[PDB]
Every structure is written in structure tokens, then in C-alpha cells.
Coordinates of all heavy atoms in Angstrom, one line a residue:
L290 N 100.5 45.6 -18.9 CA 100.9 44.7 -19.9 C 101.9 45.5 -20.8 O 101.8 46.6 -21.1 CB 99.7 44.4 -21.0 CG 98.4 44.0 -20.2 CD1 97.4 43.8 -21.2 CD2 98.6 42.8 -19.3
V291 N 103.0 44.9 -21.2 CA 104.0 45.4 -22.0 C 104.1 44.7 -23.4 O 104.3 43.5 -23.3 CB 105.3 45.6 -21.3 CG1 106.4 46.1 -22.2 CG2 105.2 46.3 -20.0
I292 N 103.9 45.4 -24.4 CA 104.1 44.9 -25.7 C 105.5 45.2 -26.2 O 105.8 46.4 -26.3 CB 103.1 45.3 -26.8 CG1 101.8 45.2 -26.2 CG2 103.3 44.6 -28.0 CD1 101.4 43.7 -25.7
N293 N 106.4 44.3 -26.3 CA 107.8 44.4 -26.5 C 108.1 44.2 -28.0 O 108.5 43.2 -28.4 CB 108.7 43.6 -25.7 CG 110.2 43.7 -26.0 OD1 110.6 44.8 -26.2 ND2 110.9 42.7 -25.7
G294 N 108.0 45.3 -28.8 CA 108.4 45.3 -30.2 C 107.5 44.6 -31.2 O 107.7 44.9 -32.5
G295 N 106.5 43.9 -30.8 CA 105.5 43.3 -31.7 C 104.3 44.1 -31.7 O 104.2 45.4 -31.9
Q296 N 103.2 43.4 -31.6 CA 101.9 44.2 -31.6 C 100.8 43.5 -30.7 O 100.9 42.2 -30.6 CB 101.4 44.5 -33.0 CG 101.5 43.3 -34.0 CD 101.2 43.8 -35.3 OE1 100.2 44.1 -35.8 NE2 102.4 44.1 -36.0
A297 N 99.9 44.3 -30.3 CA 98.7 43.7 -29.8 C 97.5 43.8 -30.8 O 97.2 44.9 -31.3 CB 98.2 44.5 -28.4
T298 N 97.0 42.6 -31.1 CA 96.0 42.7 -32.1 C 94.7 42.0 -31.6 O 94.7 41.4 -30.6 CB 96.5 42.0 -33.4 OG1 96.8 40.6 -33.2 CG2 97.7 42.6 -34.0
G299 N 93.7 41.9 -32.5 CA 92.4 41.2 -32.1 C 91.7 41.9 -31.0 O 91.8 43.2 -30.8
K300 N 91.1 41.1 -30.2 CA 90.1 41.7 -29.2 C 90.5 41.1 -27.8 O 90.4 39.9 -27.5 CB 88.6 41.6 -29.4 CG 87.7 42.2 -28.4 CD 88.2 43.7 -27.9 CE 87.0 44.3 -27.2 NZ 85.8 44.2 -28.2
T301 N 90.9 42.0 -26.8 CA 91.3 41.5 -25.4 C 90.4 42.3 -24.5 O 90.4 43.6 -24.6 CB 92.7 41.7 -25.1 OG1 93.5 41.1 -26.0 CG2 92.9 41.4 -23.8
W302 N 89.6 41.7 -23.6 CA 88.9 42.3 -22.6 C 89.8 42.5 -21.4 O 90.6 41.6 -21.0 CB 87.7 41.5 -22.2 CG 86.7 41.2 -23.2 CD1 86.6 40.1 -24.1 CD2 85.8 42.2 -23.8 NE1 85.5 40.4 -25.0 CE2 85.0 41.6 -24.8 CE3 85.4 43.5 -23.5 CZ2 84.1 42.2 -25.5 CZ3 84.4 44.1 -24.2 CH2 83.6 43.5 -25.2
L303 N 89.8 43.8 -20.8 CA 90.4 44.1 -19.5 C 89.5 44.2 -18.4 O 88.6 45.2 -18.4 CB 91.4 45.3 -19.7 CG 92.4 45.3 -20.8 CD1 93.2 46.6 -20.8 CD2 93.4 44.1 -20.6
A304 N 89.5 43.3 -17.5 CA 88.7 43.4 -16.3 C 89.5 44.0 -15.0 O 90.4 43.3 -14.6 CB 88.1 42.0 -15.8
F305 N 89.3 45.2 -14.6 CA 90.0 45.8 -13.6 C 89.4 45.7 -12.1 O 88.1 45.8 -12.0 CB 90.2 47.3 -13.8 CG 91.4 47.5 -14.7 CD1 91.2 47.6 -16.1 CD2 92.6 47.5 -14.3 CE1 92.2 47.9 -16.9 CE2 93.7 47.7 -15.2 CZ 93.4 47.9 -16.6
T306 N 90.1 45.5 -11.1 CA 89.5 45.6 -9.7 C 90.3 46.5 -9.0 O 91.6 46.6 -8.9 CB 89.7 44.1 -9.1 OG1 89.2 43.2 -10.0 CG2 89.2 44.1 -7.7
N307 N 89.6 47.5 -8.4 CA 90.2 48.5 -7.7 C 90.5 47.9 -6.3 O 89.6 47.5 -5.5 CB 89.3 49.8 -7.5 CG 89.9 50.9 -6.6 OD1 91.2 51.1 -6.6 ND2 89.1 51.7 -5.8
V308 N 91.8 47.7 -6.0 CA 92.2 47.2 -4.7 C 92.5 48.2 -3.7 O 93.1 48.1 -2.6 CB 93.5 46.3 -4.9 CG1 93.1 45.1 -5.7 CG2 94.6 47.1 -5.6
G309 N 92.0 49.6 -3.9 CA 92.0 50.5 -3.1 C 90.6 50.7 -2.5 O 89.7 49.8 -2.6
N310 N 90.3 51.7 -1.6 CA 89.1 52.0 -1.1 C 88.1 52.4 -2.2 O 88.3 53.1 -3.1 CB 89.1 53.2 -0.1 CG 87.8 53.6 0.5 OD1 86.7 52.9 0.3 ND2 87.8 54.6 1.5
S311 N 86.8 51.8 -1.9 CA 85.9 51.9 -3.0 C 85.2 53.2 -3.1 O 84.6 53.6 -4.2 CB 84.8 50.8 -2.9 OG 83.8 50.9 -3.8
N312 N 85.2 54.0 -2.1 CA 84.7 55.4 -2.3 C 85.7 56.5 -2.4 O 85.4 57.6 -2.4 CB 83.8 55.8 -0.9 CG 84.6 55.6 0.4 OD1 85.8 55.9 0.6 ND2 83.8 55.0 1.2
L313 N 87.1 56.1 -2.6 CA 88.2 57.1 -2.8 C 88.5 57.0 -4.3 O 89.2 56.1 -4.8 CB 89.5 56.7 -2.0 CG 89.4 57.4 -0.6 CD1 90.8 57.2 0.1 CD2 89.2 58.9 -0.9
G314 N 88.2 58.1 -5.0 CA 88.6 58.2 -6.3 C 89.3 59.5 -6.5 O 88.9 60.6 -6.2
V315 N 90.7 59.4 -6.9 CA 91.5 60.6 -7.2 C 91.6 60.6 -8.7 O 91.9 59.6 -9.3 CB 92.8 60.4 -6.5 CG1 93.8 61.5 -7.1 CG2 92.7 60.5 -5.0
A316 N 91.5 61.8 -9.3 CA 91.6 62.0 -10.8 C 93.0 61.6 -11.2 O 94.0 61.6 -10.5 CB 91.3 63.4 -11.1
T317 N 93.1 61.1 -12.4 CA 94.4 60.8 -13.1 C 95.1 62.2 -13.6 O 94.4 63.2 -13.5 CB 94.2 59.7 -14.2 OG1 93.4 60.3 -15.2 CG2 93.7 58.5 -13.7
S318 N 96.2 62.1 -13.9 CA 97.0 63.3 -14.4 C 97.7 62.9 -15.6 O 98.2 61.8 -15.9 CB 98.0 63.6 -13.3 OG 97.4 64.4 -12.3
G319 N 97.8 64.0 -16.5 CA 98.4 63.8 -17.8 C 97.8 62.8 -18.6 O 96.5 62.8 -18.9
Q320 N 98.5 61.9 -19.2 CA 97.8 60.8 -20.0 C 97.3 59.7 -19.1 O 96.4 58.9 -19.7 CB 99.0 60.1 -20.7 CG 99.4 60.9 -22.1 CD 100.5 60.2 -22.8 OE1 101.7 60.5 -22.4 NE2 100.3 59.6 -23.9

């Protein structure tokens, strides 16, 4: 999602689906 110059307000739920292998987890890096 890209907020272009305005703002994200209120409450939004994010439902993620891993479309990779379910037993493969690689740590994130940096932020």
C-alpha cells in the first residue's frame, strides 16, 4: 500500500497470505 501525500487514518486490518513454502521462513533484514 502506498499513501501518496495524504494519510492513513482509522483502523485497517491487514490479512497476509504467505504464497511461499509454509515451512520456509527467512529472517527479514534492516527495517
Side-chain angles (χ1 to χ4, degrees):
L290 320 176
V291 180
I292 311 304
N293 178 31
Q296 42 196 278
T298 61
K300 180 47 159 313
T301 300
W302 301 101
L303 301 184
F305 281 96
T306 308
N307 184 29
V308 290
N310 179 356
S311 181
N312 51 48
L313 267 186
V315 168
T317 60
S318 282
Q320 281 170 282

